[PDB]
């Protein structure tokens, strides 16, 4: 459960945030969207499925894992959304159309958000557009993100975290340098001053030769938590695949209702037919001759016309 450089924060300006969005999928037929986020949702601080809460990277002097309840989260695009599910790095919600999708948390003291400019539309399955699926109508094969979090949509690779060299993780001594971490924290420090130097330490260490803090780095050997491939956390010196995680909310084939505009009133005349059509929403009409040539044509009718 890492953190990433989020294009937008509570301030439109980009900033680092615990819940950076990484990818957005919307191939559903109901307009539900699957969002992968830097935070881990539905797992406790230990890594067990406490579905009522989520875990995310720190926002302070050490990269510890903090917990919060789901009810402070909110997946919102133009307006808000029916959050349909969550698991680990993935959130699922059905949202209205909008130019962007935003994930936000409202903890007051820890009130953050993240946005990715992503064009989401009110796509509809079938051959007749609708604002809302109809009650009575033909059922057609459609695909939707299965609300069952146990389902598997695929997998994402992941890796051990690299160095997270806090600015406060190190010190300067009015002309000298120092490595001052918390008590008992086995911290690796590395610094080139005249020549390459490195050492593991657990307490304040007066550096030799170094003068400016920018000369040095330091990061503890905390690999206990794996990290997704996401760009904003530098890879470890070894970037081999660490297992996998199943992508939740499998895109599952199913059936969805589609409307059936009032049957067109035909009119019969010499080698020609007239179709009187009536559909309050855009509706696809297609006609083809069964002859040697198709002479096929397609037209989205609207309203009432002939």
């Amino acid at each position: 459960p890492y953190l990433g450089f989020c294009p937008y924060c509570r301030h439109s300006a980009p900033c680092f945030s615990p819940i950076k969005i990484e990818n957005v999928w919307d191939e559903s037929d109901d307009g539900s969207i699957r969002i992968q986020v830097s935070a881990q949702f539905g797992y406790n601080q230990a890594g067990t499925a406490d579905v009522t809460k989520f875990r995310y990277m720190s926002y302070d002097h050490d990269h510890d894992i903090k917990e919060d309840s789901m009810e402070k989260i909110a997946i919102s695009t133009s307006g808000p959304c029916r959050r349909l599910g969550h698991k680990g790095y993935f959130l699922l919600a059905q949202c209205p159309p909008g130019d962007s999708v935003t994930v936000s948390i409202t903890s007051g003291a820890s009130e953050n958000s993240c946005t990715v400019e992503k064009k989401i539309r009110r796509k509809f399955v079938g051959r007749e557009e609708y604002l809302f699926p109809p009650v009575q109508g033909k059922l057609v094969k459609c695909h939707v993100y299965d609300r069952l979090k146990e389902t598997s949509a695929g997998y994402i690779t992941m890796h051990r975290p690299g160095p997270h060299a806090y600015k406060s993780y190190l010190k300067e001594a009015s002309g000298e340098v120092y490595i001052k971490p918390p008590s008992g924290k086995n911290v690796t420090y590395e610094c080139k001053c005249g020549d390459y130097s490195t050492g593991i330490v657990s307490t304040q260490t007066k550096m030799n030769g170094c003068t400016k803090a920018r000369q040095c780095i330091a990061y503890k050997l905390d690999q206990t938590k794996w990290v997704f491939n996401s760009p904003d956390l530098i890879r470890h010196t070894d970037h081999s695949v660490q297992g996998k995680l199943h992508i939740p909310f499998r895109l599952t084939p199913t059936v969805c209702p589609v409307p059936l505009a009032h049957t067109p009133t035909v009119t019969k005349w010499f080698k020609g037919i007239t179709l009187h059509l009536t559909a309050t929403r855009p509706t696809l009409l297609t006609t083809r001759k069964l002859g040697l040539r198709a002479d096929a044509t397609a037209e989205w009718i609207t309203g009432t016309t002939s």
């Binding site: 450089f5 980009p14 680092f16 760009p231 904003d232 530098i234």
Partner: protein, 48 residues
Amino acid sequence: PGAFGDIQASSLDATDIVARTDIRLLKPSVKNIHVPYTQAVSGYEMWK
């Protein structure tokens, strides 16, 4: 790039994936670590 078949494989689960996408990466610029990059719109979606 930017056309149908920009990414292809013998089968969806297969590792034999080949692709042409004009993917190119710009020199990191912002203070924060980043990897700004650009690509043609997904040719499959463009054809869609």
